[PDB]
Amino acid sequence: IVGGYTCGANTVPYQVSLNSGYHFCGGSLINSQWVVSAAHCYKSGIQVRLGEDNINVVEGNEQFISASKSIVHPSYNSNTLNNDIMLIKLKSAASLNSRVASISLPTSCASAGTQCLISGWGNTKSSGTSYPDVLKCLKAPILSDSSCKSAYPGQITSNMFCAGYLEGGKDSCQGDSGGPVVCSGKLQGIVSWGSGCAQKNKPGVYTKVCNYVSWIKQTIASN
Numbered sequence: 001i002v003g004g005y006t007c008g009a010n011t012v013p014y015q016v017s018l019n020s021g022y023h024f025c026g027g028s029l030i031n032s033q034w035v036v037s038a039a040h041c042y043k044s045g046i047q048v049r050l051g052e053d054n055i056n057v058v059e060g061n062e063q064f065i066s067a068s069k070s071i072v073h074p075s076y077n078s079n080t081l082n083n084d085i086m087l088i089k090l091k092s093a094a095s096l097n098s099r100v101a102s103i104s105l106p107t108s109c110a111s112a113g114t115q116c117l118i119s120g121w122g123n124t125k126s127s128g129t130s131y132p133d134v135l136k137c138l139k140a141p142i143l144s145d146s147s148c149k150s151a152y153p154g155q156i157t158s159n160m161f162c163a164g165y166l167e168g169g170k171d172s173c174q175g176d177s178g179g180p181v182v183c184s185g186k187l188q189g190i191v192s193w194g195s196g197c198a199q200k201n202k203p204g205v206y207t208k209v210c211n212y213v214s215w216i217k218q219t220i221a222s223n
């Protein structure tokens with residue numbers, strides 16, 4: 001996250017870190033047994049880490065649980081990143097508490113202008129590499145589809161939305177992929193892609209979760 005702040009230990013209780021020997025993507029806990037992340041974060045051998053703040057220090061509130069199965073969206077296209085969402089089932093149910101909580105799925109889609117909270121352990125430099133050990137947060141509004149489509153001609157589909165600042169300076173970045181974009185208490189997006197990080201007129205692009213609620217509900221109930 002570039003231009004964000006330190007969230008605070010466990011202030012984003014639904015945030016997860018996907019680890020395969022090191023942190024490689026974020027995710028969101030939707031209930032005691034399931035996590036939603038991005039399809040492009042798919043890997044074999046994932047361990048989900050909940051109640052994390054510093055990913056390099058075991059501070060006492062973590063739960064490390066291996067995944068039993070991963071389900072990438074049936075129509076995920078890795079070339080365009082359309083339908084970039086994937087579900088991860090935990091081998092054991094997580095113990096929800098103040099530090100580990102699930103986030104609600106939306107009942108409707110959010111409007112442009114709505115302020116959201118984006119979080120993760122990704123790069124914090126636009127021009128440079130600096131990976132933080134503690135969770136960074138960023139408040140950013142959803143942008144109108146017109147400004148999103150003008151920035152990425154012929155690349156935005158109905159399953160994506162842009163959030164951020166066109167002036168640049170604030171944005172999600174690599175290492176943040178798969179993490180949450182929560183607006184008005186609902187999980188509305190998943191960190192998916194962008195053009196570099198925090199560049200002027202290149203906002204981040206997020207998977208539009210409101211379009212997948214029936215798929216999510218049906219899939220977890222049958223697995």
Ligand SMILES: [Ca+2]
Pocket residue numbers: 052053054055056057058059062
């Ligand atoms: Ca830790």
Ligand SMILES: [Zn+2]
Pocket residue numbers: 040174175177192193
């Ligand atoms: Zn990514």
